[PDB]
Amino acid sequence: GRVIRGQRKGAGSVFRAHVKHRKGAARLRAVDFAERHGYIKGIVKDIIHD
């Protein structure tokens, strides 16, 4: 037979995600001394839709 489409999806030729207009990867703050022991404050500036 022939390779099925669910099986073709692994190579990611035309099945890769469309990521040009994404605004970035949403991640928490990195671990450091300040947040490990005390705390720091940050200002919220924008709320975006990606």
């Binding site: 037979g1 022939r2 390779v3 099925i4 669910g6």
Partner: protein, 49 residues
């Protein structure tokens, strides 16, 4: 899959659109065969929790 051809899918083919074999495939099935309900513990409409 049933709308496809047998060369294209393990379900395609026949004079009627029917799967022709149990839809529950085992977990250890090779890629290209592992379609349908993947290692289903149960099937059908849920009745309760």
């Amino acid at each position: 899959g049933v709308a496809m051809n047998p060369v294209e899918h393990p379900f395609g083919g026949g004079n009627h659109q029917h799967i022709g074999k149990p839809s529950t495939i085992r977990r250890d099935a090779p890629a290209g065969r592992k379609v349908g309900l993947i290692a289903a513990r149960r099937t059908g409409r849920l009745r309760g929790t």
